[PDB]
Amino acid sequence: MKASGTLREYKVVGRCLPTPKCRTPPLYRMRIFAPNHVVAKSRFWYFVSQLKKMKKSSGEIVYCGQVFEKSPLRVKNFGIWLRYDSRSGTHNMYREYRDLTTAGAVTQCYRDMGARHRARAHSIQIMKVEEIAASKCRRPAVKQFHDSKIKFPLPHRVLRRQHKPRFTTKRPNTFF
Amino acid sequence: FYVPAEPKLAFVIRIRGINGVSPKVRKVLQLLRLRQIFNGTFVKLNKASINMLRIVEPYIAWGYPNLKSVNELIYKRGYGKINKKRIALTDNTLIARSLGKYNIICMEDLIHEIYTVGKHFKEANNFLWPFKLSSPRGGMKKKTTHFVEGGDAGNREDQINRLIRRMN
Amino acid sequence: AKSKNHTTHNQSRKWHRNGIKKPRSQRYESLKGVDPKFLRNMRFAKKHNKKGLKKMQANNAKAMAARAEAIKALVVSRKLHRLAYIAHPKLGRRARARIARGLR
Amino acid sequence: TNTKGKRRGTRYMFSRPFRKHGVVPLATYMRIYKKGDIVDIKGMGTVQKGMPHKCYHGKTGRVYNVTQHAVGIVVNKQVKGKILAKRINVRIEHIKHSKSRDSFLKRVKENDQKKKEAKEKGTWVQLKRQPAPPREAHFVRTNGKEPELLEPIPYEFMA
RNA sequence: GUCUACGGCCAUACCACCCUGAACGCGCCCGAUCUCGUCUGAUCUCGGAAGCUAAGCAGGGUCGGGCCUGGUUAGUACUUGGAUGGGAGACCGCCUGGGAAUACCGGGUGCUGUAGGCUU
RNA sequence: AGCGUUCAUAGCGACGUCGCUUUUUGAUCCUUCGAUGUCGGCUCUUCCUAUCAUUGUGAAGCAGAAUUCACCAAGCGUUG
RNA sequence: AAACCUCCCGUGGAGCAGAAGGGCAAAAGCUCGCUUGAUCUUGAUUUUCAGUACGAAUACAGACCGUGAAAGCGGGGCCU
RNA sequence: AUUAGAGGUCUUGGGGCCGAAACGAUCUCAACCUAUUCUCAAACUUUAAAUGGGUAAGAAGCCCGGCUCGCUGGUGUGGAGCCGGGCGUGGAAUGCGAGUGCCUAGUGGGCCACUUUUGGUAAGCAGAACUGGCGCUGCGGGAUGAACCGAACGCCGGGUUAAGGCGCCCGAUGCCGACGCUCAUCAGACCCCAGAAAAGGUGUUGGUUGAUAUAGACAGCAGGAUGGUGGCCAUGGAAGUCGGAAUCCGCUAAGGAGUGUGUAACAACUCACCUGCCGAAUCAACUAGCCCUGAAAAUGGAUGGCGCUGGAGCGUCGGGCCCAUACCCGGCCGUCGCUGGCAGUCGGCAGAGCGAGAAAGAGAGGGACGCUACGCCGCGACGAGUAGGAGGGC
């Protein structure tokens, strides 16, 4: 699990091999977040082998599909439940974000945990991504965007293209 | 649901060099005819073959080839092992001379035997010299670690077709 | 002035240079060490094998003819199949003579 | 260094198993062995005489000489990059009929059976063992019920 | 249905206590002249048949012990292979494969070969 | 924990535990046996601060004196 | 408390020359009876191993014997 | 080996107690026994892996028929050995031409690393197992480097890469890079690797858990802040303030039976629980990121240097881009292989072929070159090298 690129979401279902002892095994659905579907089906076995006694040698993937966003043009407040590991013991977390797709939020969560806690991607176990309303929010860094009349300027502007006219004559204005 | 058939064909490309290799791995990589870096080969899959592919998992980058992926490999890099001599396939009378005892008399036959793994794959696949692929144009991600953890070694199931387009 | 005492380091590599040859198998391995009383009889059975020479030639011969009576009491589509017949040298000659008149 | 004793390091190799000490069952004796039987070696501590060395406990060989209470075996012993087909004399007590061969002898029966049979039918049936292939394309019925969703549990410090 | 003799497997067959055993059989049991052997006919040996299932023995029972076989413990412990992974280290996490053991909770409690009876 | 009348920490600090330093001795045998002159003292230079004095300061079980503890600090001294 | 006698329980918790390990319950132990296989002679093999010895050991074979009703067992020590 | 209580009985007993004296009795305290309970074992073990070690996967095999034997015997029984005849779908996958005999140099000081591992406090220490390295070996990268990472080498052109990089030295980000994190009066800055720990921080960023709020917080300011009582066993006096025990209630918002600011105790007042105005979040404890303290050596000094703070730092990640003697393509040299091809230059005694997918017949009733055959020619593949060996030297 290398959290490369924008993550996607996959609904992968599997089951044990059919045996004369048990006619048809039950089906197990998951929600995996992976860059490509190949490392999705691998990350699938990692979870099911610790919630069940099943391994890839005694299972079969039944459906490796990608699920798209129901409303990619709506802004949403996503609630993520984590299981990351530090250098000393593992912890449960509840991190909140604000994005357009759940995969857009999960990616954002992976960059943030790496940024705020120096945890690499192989240490984190996303367990629940729930769409919650603006009243059930808890983290203050996202509640501040709940305003029908939000209004804010752009402060002192970090001038880009600072190398295209590399040797100018005028002092570059930063107040737009 | 519809569980599709597990793929009967695999294209194996060696990615690591020859220096400092385990003897059990070295014996296997010469049974797959992969004595050189970036050499390719087709392998028909079965329980007796996958368990050899697990042994050389850090050294190979294999997957399931596409129909186009076979065409480009046989046309551009196809060389027949005619009388223990690597000879290009610029004429059909080089195949039908040697593979004529298996009704393979053209290149489309030879592709049809390789792609749809038939009952004459062994003589067909051993006829082709190991493919001398080029270095991957575009650059690998990481030669060392497994494809699942960001690297490039291991079973990149359908993505092996993308790897061919650049290396071929 | 101590020194190293023992090490099997390069050895496994040294053995597989010329290969670890399995011992050479051959039918009729030697009858050495086999117990004498059984072997002593076995040489007697080979010493007196000419005694049944006349019987043996007069046993398989009457068994040679008895085998000669059990025999004496008895003794993907048609399109590509067709084109596969015209494309044969040794048994398609008569076939492709129909095309030779097609130019005529 | 180590000693070159015959039984150096055979504290568990020749010890009888748990709750199996004592007199040995008599079918270990009344079992016959012709010449050329695939026979394996497993040293038994209760019978001190006729014991093999510890380098053959596990090795399998074939019989070439049969005496009153013993057999001669031609077993392979690897000695520093070469194999030696050396003959050892072992009593019956340290001997079993190896079953690593008869399952091929069973396969010879049906291979001789299915070659004579189905010949008059004019058909050609498979004889060689093919390895376990990849499984074929099939359906999966998920009648009525929906596949249950799995979730990684949170962390509970168990100590 | 079952027993005796000889067994095979060697506790699913053992051990503790309780119950019931038709018929044959096995036993107990009655004796010491001869055979044989003891301090002692208890044992061993021998001659019998008045009595008896009391015991041995067989079948059964026990929220039985043990044993046997599963579940659980547990994809835990550990482990093959891989990384310019983490960590000051101790050690840990991931990838690729294999995968245990108590406690605990169940199920089970001899099969069978040859010969000969009995139930005719 | 205790000592310190009282009062754990002004100053100390047991039972434990974590380091640092190479001005002690060890351990090691890597470099030198076709030789690197092997104790001290005398002479002379520079450097380090784990600060004895002095400059500036904090804290005391600092009333004043004297003395402790800690900080910045190696500029200048440290003798017959 | 420990002499001897009797019953019961007793898987080895004892014993088998010695160091330890393995093995052993109508025995390999203990006790009696008869004995000299601890004898004579070819080879083959195992162990250390160069696959040489010596030592030790295992399977036989040919004799002469022991014991036992007999099957058998024994050419030293239950094995190392 | 080892810790702790439980329940038992006089099972023996230690001093006991009404008992002369009694398993009569007494609380016991011990062992002893029975269910439990904590912790272990390189020289303990019922269980017991992973990795690993043999063997098998046919023609030397199968299946018939019959002889020979001094061996073996109730029994042409047993076994062994002979003949003779019959069965090829060659009886798992993959790969590869094998077998075999002489003569034989050098070597017989080794060393390093992942993992396992013994001694040792430890060591760039000593000693082993497995595999690969170095030695015998250049090359790209790690600034530098016997061993690390990549990759192994004939001589060249083009392309592309690996591990590493891309502010400048210095090839490449002069991307309209992404999202955060961190200010250091000692910042930090990439395997091996060349330096730090316990502990701590109201530095800041996340989390975890539990409490407080229109029945009104948290500060803030302003008010009661007493009383039986100035409590007494009382110390000369302690009346809220020297030192322990009672540590209640009625009135009732409530007042600790007094935590502080002072004398001999007060007066004096501000301290609790509560009032009020103002009225929305606040408190308490843990946790982990970066940062700081903890953190002291001798020539002047080392993320490689410069320097860098909307990073040129740390974390997660993008496209692009840079280049090795590695890979692809092409040329040339050589070696090796095909145990390759060529005597067929067969001509007015002539008639120009044997590249053809398919066991075998172009069968008879005047014309360049060449072939020192120890010569010439064509295909493939390959090329490191000390000690050492051999071959060829126009």
PDB file of N, CA and C (backbone and C1' of nucleotides) in Angstrom, chain F residues 48-64:
ATOM      1  P     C F  48      39.625  26.881  22.647  1.00  0.00           P
ATOM      2  O5'   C F  48      39.218  25.650  23.560  1.00  0.00           O
ATOM      3  C5'   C F  48      38.816  24.424  22.977  1.00  0.00           C
ATOM      4  C4'   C F  48      38.564  23.380  24.029  1.00  0.00           C
ATOM      5  C3'   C F  48      37.711  23.837  25.194  1.00  0.00           C
ATOM      6  O3'   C F  48      36.333  23.753  24.902  1.00  0.00           O
ATOM      7  C1'   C F  48      39.620  22.685  25.994  1.00  0.00           C
ATOM      8  P     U F  49      35.335  24.897  25.399  1.00  0.00           P
ATOM      9  O5'   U F  49      35.116  24.552  26.930  1.00  0.00           O
ATOM     10  C5'   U F  49      34.678  23.259  27.322  1.00  0.00           C
ATOM     11  C4'   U F  49      34.516  23.149  28.815  1.00  0.00           C
ATOM     12  C3'   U F  49      33.732  24.281  29.467  1.00  0.00           C
ATOM     13  O3'   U F  49      32.940  23.761  30.521  1.00  0.00           O
ATOM     14  C1'   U F  49      35.866  24.125  30.449  1.00  0.00           C
ATOM     15  P     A F  50      31.344  23.741  30.399  1.00  0.00           P
ATOM     16  O5'   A F  50      30.950  22.607  31.429  1.00  0.00           O
ATOM     17  C5'   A F  50      31.828  21.511  31.625  1.00  0.00           C
ATOM     18  C4'   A F  50      32.167  21.298  33.077  1.00  0.00           C
ATOM     19  C3'   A F  50      33.458  21.951  33.548  1.00  0.00           C
ATOM     20  O3'   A F  50      33.370  22.233  34.944  1.00  0.00           O
ATOM     21  C1'   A F  50      33.659  19.612  33.705  1.00  0.00           C
ATOM     22  P     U F  51      32.901  23.676  35.470  1.00  0.00           P
ATOM     23  O5'   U F  51      34.253  24.497  35.644  1.00  0.00           O
ATOM     24  C5'   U F  51      35.124  24.246  36.738  1.00  0.00           C
ATOM     25  C4'   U F  51      35.460  25.501  37.508  1.00  0.00           C
ATOM     26  C3'   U F  51      34.321  26.091  38.334  1.00  0.00           C
ATOM     27  O3'   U F  51      34.857  26.718  39.495  1.00  0.00           O
ATOM     28  C1'   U F  51      35.062  27.682  36.769  1.00  0.00           C
ATOM     29  P     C F  52      35.101  25.900  40.855  1.00  0.00           P
ATOM     30  O5'   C F  52      36.434  26.546  41.419  1.00  0.00           O
ATOM     31  C5'   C F  52      36.710  26.564  42.806  1.00  0.00           C
ATOM     32  C4'   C F  52      37.927  27.395  43.088  1.00  0.00           C
ATOM     33  C3'   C F  52      37.781  28.877  42.815  1.00  0.00           C
ATOM     34  O3'   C F  52      37.143  29.567  43.868  1.00  0.00           O
ATOM     35  C1'   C F  52      39.788  28.098  41.862  1.00  0.00           C
ATOM     36  P     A F  53      36.181  30.806  43.549  1.00  0.00           P
ATOM     37  O5'   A F  53      37.186  31.981  43.196  1.00  0.00           O
ATOM     38  C5'   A F  53      38.128  32.430  44.151  1.00  0.00           C
ATOM     39  C4'   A F  53      39.159  33.322  43.521  1.00  0.00           C
ATOM     40  C3'   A F  53      38.626  34.550  42.818  1.00  0.00           C
ATOM     41  O3'   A F  53      38.306  35.595  43.710  1.00  0.00           O
ATOM     42  C1'   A F  53      40.201  33.494  41.437  1.00  0.00           C
ATOM     43  P     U F  54      36.886  36.323  43.602  1.00  0.00           P
ATOM     44  O5'   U F  54      37.064  37.315  42.377  1.00  0.00           O
ATOM     45  C5'   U F  54      38.085  38.291  42.395  1.00  0.00           C
ATOM     46  C4'   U F  54      38.339  38.833  41.018  1.00  0.00           C
ATOM     47  C3'   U F  54      37.124  39.346  40.277  1.00  0.00           C
ATOM     48  O3'   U F  54      36.730  40.636  40.686  1.00  0.00           O
ATOM     49  C1'   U F  54      38.446  38.017  38.833  1.00  0.00           C
ATOM     50  P     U F  55      35.177  40.942  40.919  1.00  0.00           P
ATOM     51  O5'   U F  55      34.635  41.266  39.461  1.00  0.00           O
ATOM     52  C5'   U F  55      35.124  42.386  38.748  1.00  0.00           C
ATOM     53  C4'   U F  55      34.470  42.510  37.400  1.00  0.00           C
ATOM     54  C3'   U F  55      32.963  42.358  37.386  1.00  0.00           C
ATOM     55  O3'   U F  55      32.299  43.549  37.744  1.00  0.00           O
ATOM     56  C1'   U F  55      33.905  41.046  35.670  1.00  0.00           C
ATOM     57  P     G F  56      31.174  43.516  38.882  1.00  0.00           P
ATOM     58  O5'   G F  56      29.857  43.085  38.100  1.00  0.00           O
ATOM     59  C5'   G F  56      29.448  43.785  36.937  1.00  0.00           C
ATOM     60  C4'   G F  56      28.546  42.947  36.068  1.00  0.00           C
ATOM     61  C3'   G F  56      27.305  42.403  36.734  1.00  0.00           C
ATOM     62  O3'   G F  56      26.270  43.355  36.826  1.00  0.00           O
ATOM     63  C1'   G F  56      28.329  40.697  35.478  1.00  0.00           C
ATOM     64  P     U F  57      25.583  43.641  38.242  1.00  0.00           P
ATOM     65  O5'   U F  57      24.463  42.521  38.362  1.00  0.00           O
ATOM     66  C5'   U F  57      24.769  41.256  38.919  1.00  0.00           C
ATOM     67  C4'   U F  57      24.053  40.156  38.190  1.00  0.00           C
ATOM     68  C3'   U F  57      23.059  39.379  39.019  1.00  0.00           C
ATOM     69  O3'   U F  57      21.819  40.043  39.105  1.00  0.00           O
ATOM     70  C1'   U F  57      24.430  37.882  37.825  1.00  0.00           C
ATOM     71  P     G F  58      20.820  39.721  40.308  1.00  0.00           P
ATOM     72  O5'   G F  58      20.164  38.355  39.864  1.00  0.00           O
ATOM     73  C5'   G F  58      19.158  37.765  40.651  1.00  0.00           C
ATOM     74  C4'   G F  58      18.968  36.327  40.283  1.00  0.00           C
ATOM     75  C3'   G F  58      18.675  35.409  41.441  1.00  0.00           C
ATOM     76  O3'   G F  58      17.321  35.451  41.832  1.00  0.00           O
ATOM     77  C1'   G F  58      20.356  34.461  40.115  1.00  0.00           C
ATOM     78  P     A F  59      16.955  35.763  43.357  1.00  0.00           P
ATOM     79  O5'   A F  59      17.160  34.368  44.085  1.00  0.00           O
ATOM     80  C5'   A F  59      16.606  33.183  43.544  1.00  0.00           C
ATOM     81  C4'   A F  59      17.151  31.961  44.229  1.00  0.00           C
ATOM     82  C3'   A F  59      17.225  32.032  45.740  1.00  0.00           C
ATOM     83  O3'   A F  59      15.981  31.756  46.355  1.00  0.00           O
ATOM     84  C1'   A F  59      19.259  31.204  44.890  1.00  0.00           C
ATOM     85  P     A F  60      15.700  32.228  47.858  1.00  0.00           P
ATOM     86  O5'   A F  60      16.386  31.091  48.727  1.00  0.00           O
ATOM     87  C5'   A F  60      16.732  31.315  50.080  1.00  0.00           C
ATOM     88  C4'   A F  60      17.825  30.382  50.511  1.00  0.00           C
ATOM     89  C3'   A F  60      18.493  30.709  51.832  1.00  0.00           C
ATOM     90  O3'   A F  60      17.769  30.203  52.936  1.00  0.00           O
ATOM     91  C1'   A F  60      20.136  30.258  50.195  1.00  0.00           C
ATOM     92  P     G F  61      17.141  31.191  54.032  1.00  0.00           P
ATOM     93  O5'   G F  61      17.262  30.379  55.393  1.00  0.00           O
ATOM     94  C5'   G F  61      18.219  30.747  56.377  1.00  0.00           C
ATOM     95  C4'   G F  61      19.054  29.566  56.796  1.00  0.00           C
ATOM     96  C3'   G F  61      20.123  29.150  55.799  1.00  0.00           C
ATOM     97  O3'   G F  61      21.352  29.790  56.105  1.00  0.00           O
ATOM     98  C1'   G F  61      18.784  27.274  56.401  1.00  0.00           C
ATOM     99  P     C F  62      22.427  30.165  54.976  1.00  0.00           P
ATOM    100  O5'   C F  62      21.733  31.319  54.130  1.00  0.00           O
ATOM    101  C5'   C F  62      21.229  32.483  54.764  1.00  0.00           C
ATOM    102  C4'   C F  62      21.941  33.727  54.303  1.00  0.00           C
ATOM    103  C3'   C F  62      21.319  35.032  54.754  1.00  0.00           C
ATOM    104  O3'   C F  62      21.700  35.378  56.071  1.00  0.00           O
ATOM    105  C1'   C F  62      21.915  35.164  52.462  1.00  0.00           C
ATOM    106  P     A F  63      20.659  35.239  57.278  1.00  0.00           P
ATOM    107  O5'   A F  63      20.364  36.742  57.707  1.00  0.00           O
ATOM    108  C5'   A F  63      19.766  37.657  56.803  1.00  0.00           C
ATOM    109  C4'   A F  63      20.075  39.079  57.185  1.00  0.00           C
ATOM    110  C3'   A F  63      21.481  39.563  56.879  1.00  0.00           C
ATOM    111  O3'   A F  63      21.643  39.983  55.537  1.00  0.00           O
ATOM    112  C1'   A F  63      20.942  40.121  59.096  1.00  0.00           C
ATOM    113  P     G F  64      23.065  39.839  54.809  1.00  0.00           P
ATOM    114  O5'   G F  64      24.046  40.719  55.690  1.00  0.00           O
ATOM    115  C5'   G F  64      24.030  42.132  55.632  1.00  0.00           C
ATOM    116  C4'   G F  64      25.186  42.689  56.409  1.00  0.00           C
ATOM    117  C3'   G F  64      26.530  42.083  56.065  1.00  0.00           C
ATOM    118  O3'   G F  64      27.111  42.651  54.912  1.00  0.00           O
ATOM    119  C1'   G F  64      26.263  42.074  58.393  1.00  0.00           C
TER     120        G F  64
END
